[PDB]
Design a protein around this ligand. Structure first.
Ligand SMILES: CCNC(=O)OC[C@H]1O[C@@H](n2cnc3c(=O)[nH]c(N)nc32)[C@H](O)[C@@H]1O
Ligand SMILES: [Cl-]
Lengths: 112, 115
């Protein structure tokens, strides 16, 4: 099934895009939990990390490399936190794999 | 020494004990000594990378491998209701060990924001 992130990838609804390539998209989160809070998502519709395949390893690592590069470009020189949520206990909100990147404030422990 | 001399490098080389869940040629999964959830483990590369901000472009497959191993271990540990994966970078990220690592937490409802 389609999700709102599919609509964002397809440019059907607006989002504040930070970076795009042939295989992923980074954009600011509409409900930010830190002064900087963006998402990096694959264009391939993987519904959740628990169903990713071995062949997806490069793509998943690409989300993290893009995420760390965007974080540097956004001036997060004091650090940041990356989060992937899975399922109900993980608090996953959209069933399209997404990497949260949060910074601009002290992130606390435990991480939720 | 291969893996460096952070606590995680020592664990990689079996010089400090740990409760190991999974091991392959690229990574190691082991339980966190100060768990923040009923299940809380770490997946780390055997290659020493100090922090995600300095990872190289050719580290992509290895970083993704941490997540695939993390999700496989979570399933093998019975985290059928889900889990949260976390990478901490630097001071604002709460990083305390400068060897790249993926936290996996579950067995309870995780809250938002994630710290
Ligand atoms: C605070 C989160 N930011 C961070 O950088 O997390 C690093 C994580 O490494 C864990 N840890 C430290 N020493 C040891 C050790 O000897 N053994 C084990 N099995 N885990 C350890 C620590 O509890 C923390 O959650
Ligand atoms: Cl989520």
């Amino acid at each position: 099934g389609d999700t709102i992130f599919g609509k964002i990838i397809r440019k059907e609804i607006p989002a504040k895009i930070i970076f795009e390539d042939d295989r992923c998209l980074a954009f600011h989160d509409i409900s930010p939990q830190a002064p900087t809070h963006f998402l990096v998502i694959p264009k391939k519709h993987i519904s959740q990390i628990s169903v990713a395949e071995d062949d997806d390893e490069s793509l998943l690592g690409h989300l993290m490399i893009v995420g760390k590069k965007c974080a540097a470009d956004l001036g997060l020189n004091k650090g940041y936190r990356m989060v992937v949520n899975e399922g109900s206990d993980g608090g996953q909100s959209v069933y399209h794999v997404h990497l949260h990147v949060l910074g601009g404030r002290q992130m606390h422990w435990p991480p939720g």
